[PDB]
């Protein structure tokens, strides 16, 4: 359908930080946003397949 | 065969042993009948059984892994993941196929090894008192029933209580 456009951008937060916005227009701001506590890193598998219940 | 046993003067095995990997044939007065030697076939065991535990469980050292994950922006990348990932599996594979290839010819040297030191074992304890035939049998020039044969499995045999016997049997067939 539409034309134009729609980039999305995301920085992660520190626990006591603020983060500050300001716009004059052409803007999409956030209603919710996520809470994170990384450990250890992984990836995406790429499968077909749907969950089996087991280990 | 590398020790000259089993594709060597011991031309086949016999089936009717199925106690052990090693073993006799007596045929005395009594009757006939196999009869395996446990220990040192016990022994063969505890070392293969240590060979396959030794090639799986010293590669132990292995991680976290993952696959791929790059934008067709950034195909460079995802080319050098492929030069190192398919490299891996080359030197794997042909390290794992070659290490097969080797531990199996001198797994099966190991048994031909055990053979002929069994052999060698039973020869060198009746030296003039039996006949060695070349088929790995051994002819007796007395008689040896079934409770003097335990001796030569056991290993406990006495040349003196039976070399008159036979020495005195030698010079009857030179004639
Ligand atoms: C975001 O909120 C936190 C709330 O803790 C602010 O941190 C406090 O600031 C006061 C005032 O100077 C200090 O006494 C303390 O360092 C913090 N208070 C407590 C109770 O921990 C923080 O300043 C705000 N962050 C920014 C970047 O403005």
């Known amino acids: 359908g539409q034309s134009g456009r729609m980039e999305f951008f995301w920085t992660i937060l520190k626990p006591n930080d603020a983060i500050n916005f300001e716009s004059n227009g052409n803007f999409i ?6 809470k994170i506590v990384k450990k250890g890193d992984s990836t995406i598998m ?10 | 065969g590398l020790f000259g046993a ?33 220990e040192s ?20 050292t292995q991680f976290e892994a993952v696959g791929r994950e790059f934008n067709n922006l950034e195909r460079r990348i995802e080319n050098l993941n492929k030069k190192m990932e398919d490299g891996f599996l080359d030197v794997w594979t042909y390290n794992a ?37 070349g088929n790995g049998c051994f002819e007796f020039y007395h008689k ?7 001796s030569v ?9 039976y070399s008159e016997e036979a020495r005195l049997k030698r010079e009857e067939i030179s004639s």
């Open chain 1, 29 to 34: 701001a956030p209603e919710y946003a996520y």
């Open chain 1, 46 to 55: 790429k499968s077909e397949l749907e969950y089996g219940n087991c280990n």
């Open chain 2, 6 to 38: 089993i594709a060597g003067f011991i031309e086949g095995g016999w089936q009717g042993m199925v106690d052990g990997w090693y073993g006799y044939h007596h045929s005395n007065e009594q009757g006939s009948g196999y009869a395996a030697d446990k």
């Open chain 2, 41 to 60: 076939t016990q022994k063969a065991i505890d070392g293969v059984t240590n060979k396959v535990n030794s090639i799986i469980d010293k590669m132990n």
């Open chain 2, 97 to 133: 196929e070659l290490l097969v290839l080797m531990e199996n010819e001198r797994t099966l040297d190991f048994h031909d090894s055990n053979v002929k030191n069994l052999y060698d074992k039973v020869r060198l304890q009746l030296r003039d008192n039996a006949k060695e035939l």
């Open chain 2, 144 to 150: 040896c029933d079934n409770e003097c044969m335990e």
């Open chain 2, 153 to 161: 499995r056991n290993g406990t045999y006495d040349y003196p209580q």
